[PDB]
Amino acid sequence: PALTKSQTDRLEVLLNPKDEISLSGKPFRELESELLSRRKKDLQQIYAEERENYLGKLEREITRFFVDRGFLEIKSPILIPLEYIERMGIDNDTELSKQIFRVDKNFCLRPMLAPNLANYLRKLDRALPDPIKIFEIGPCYRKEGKEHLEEFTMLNFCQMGSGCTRENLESIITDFLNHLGIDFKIVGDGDTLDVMHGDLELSSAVVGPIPLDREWGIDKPWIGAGFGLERLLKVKHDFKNIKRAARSESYYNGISTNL
């Protein structure tokens, strides 16, 4: 007869975007047996050829992109002090005690790469010539009220000093997403920009100095942008849900591991 809602959820888990089949008068067991055989063969092809994870391979492809363009690869701690978040302009219980994974009474999981990269910009200005170009790829954490990934991988590149203009920032974003093969559109008039993909925010870039720069020893012009790698993988592979691209035991490269 007709497929139930739970049976449809099960088949959608085993359903790849490349599959060109409709959910045909066949029973649920026949459809499930077909998708199971396809997903098993898909993993067999990965285990015999590529064997690289989508998240890891994307980090390596992005790293080669910015290293080739004069950006220094940064690997800052994931466990940051709480004082870094208090210095970002967040206190009370608006966003400090709501979307922050605190570990000890002093440390917490970093929700963004900006505080660590800001400290690197201050220290590297004493040794490196102008301009200072750095970037980092790493995990970030934010709770939830909303609906998004709590454990995700962030990319943050930034430049300080000369050439920190909106035109230069958009040229880097354009060359970056065209390199990967991701359609986008820049939205902006707030002194900030939004890199959108239809209705999904890929990145939120910041141009020019910010009054908050004084609290981080920053007194030069700077540009930067932060991309979520799980959101990028969802767009490139046309995943219906972003959880197929995140760190999980339930999916490998958008393929279900519950076979």
Enumerate binding residues for Na ion (CB under 5 A): 191, 207
Of 205 and 235, nearer to Na ion (C-beta) is 205
Q: Write down the least CB distance from residue 211 to Na ion, Å.
A: 15
Q: Write down the least CB distance from residue 85 to Na ion, Å.
A: 25
Of 183 and 191, nearer to Na ion (C-beta) is 191
Beta strands (DSSP E) in the chain are 72-74, 79-81, 107-109, 132-141, 151-160, 185-187, 192-197, 200-206, 222-228, 251-252, 255-256
Q: Write down the least CB distance from residue 223 to Na ion, Å.
A: 10
Q: Write down the least CB distance from residue 206 to Na ion, Å.
A: 8
Q: Is 124 exposed, middle or buried (0-12, 13-18, 19+ CB in 10 A)?
A: middle
Of 19 and 191, nearer to Na ion (C-beta) is 191
Beta strands (DSSP E) in 44-129 are 72-74, 79-81, 107-109
Of 99 and 204, nearer to Na ion (C-beta) is 204
Report the distance separating Cα 53 and Cα 253, nearest Å: 6
Of 195 and 255, nearer to Na ion (C-beta) is 195
Q: Write down the least CB distance from residue 169 to Na ion, Å.
A: 9
Report the distance separating Cα 142 and Cα 90, nearest Å: 14
- Tallying the residues shown for the chain, one arrives at 259
Q: By Cβ distance, which residue is nearest to Na ion?
A: 191
